[PDB]
Amino acid sequence: FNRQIPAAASLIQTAWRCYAAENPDSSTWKIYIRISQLREHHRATIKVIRRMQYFVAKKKFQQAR
Amino acid sequence: QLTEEQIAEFKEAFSLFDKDGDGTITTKELGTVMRSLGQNPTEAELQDMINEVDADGNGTIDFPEFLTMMARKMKDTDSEEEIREAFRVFDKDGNGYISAAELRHVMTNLGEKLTDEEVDEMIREADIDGDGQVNYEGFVQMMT
Numbered sequence: 001f002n003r004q005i006p007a008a009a010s011l012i013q014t015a016w017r018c019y020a021a022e023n024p025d026s027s028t029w030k031i032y033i034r035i036s037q038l039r040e041h042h043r044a045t046i047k048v049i050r051r052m053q054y055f056v057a058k059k060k061f062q063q064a065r
Numbered sequence: 066q067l068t069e070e071q072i073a074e075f076k077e078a079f080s081l082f083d084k085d086g087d088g089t090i091t092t093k094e095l096g097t098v099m100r101s102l103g104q105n106p107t108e109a110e111l112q113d114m115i116n117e118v119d120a121d122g123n124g125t126i127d128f129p130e131f132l133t134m135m136a137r138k139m140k141d142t143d144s145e146e147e148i149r150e151a152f153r154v155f156d157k158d159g160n161g162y163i164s165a166a167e168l169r170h171v172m173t174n175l176g177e178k179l180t181d182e183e184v185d186e187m188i189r190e191a192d193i194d195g196d197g198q199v200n201y202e203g204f205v206q207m208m209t
């Protein structure tokens with residue numbers, strides 16, 4: 001009932017994760033538990049992936065509208 | 066719009082996905098990066114990611130496409146309204162406002178499921194007045 005709810009949340013969540021990752025001391029950087037010392041090459045790939053995931057969540061939100 | 070330094074950081078970013086160095090990023094290259102970060106994507110996730118960036122349709126991403134993506138001004142690019150429309154899904158009044166508690170529920174328990182630490186920053190930056198009701202149209206402007 002209302003598939004717009006998961007897509008809505010995911011669009012906001014990805015938009016904010018993309019925004020917060022511009023601050024390199026954000027708590028959003030703590031979620032990669034499986035990496036020991038977050039180096040700067042991790043951060044460059046993480047920001048690309050987050051941008052890619054935001055554009056996907058944008059797509060699936062538009063699709064549910 | 067784009068510095069010579071921004072393009073260079075983007076080229077270094079492109080190099081970290083293009084392991085083989087052929088100048089394109091395949092879905093399998095992206096899955097290797099994502100698993101190195103502790104993610105476990107499926108082939109369809111990776112294809113969804115690639116199809117949003119691939120402009121010609123070959124199923125792989127070259128540096129012009131990667132740069133087009135990384136430099137898309139996600140702020141005025143009609144994105145503000147879709148995030149509003151996203152927030153409106155949970156605004157059961159038209160209030161333009163959403164309780165901090167409702168927000169924490171939706172953010173922590175649905176969709177991507179954010180961490181409680183992450184929902185602290187979000188709620189903290191967005192509750193301008195500090196009474197437990199955030200107005201999402203101001204938060205939208207802040208993210209953009």
Ligand SMILES: [Ca+2]
Pocket residue numbers: 082083084085086087088089090091094
């Ligand atoms: Ca390659």
Ligand SMILES: [Ca+2]
Pocket residue numbers: 119120121122123124125126127130
């Ligand atoms: Ca291509």
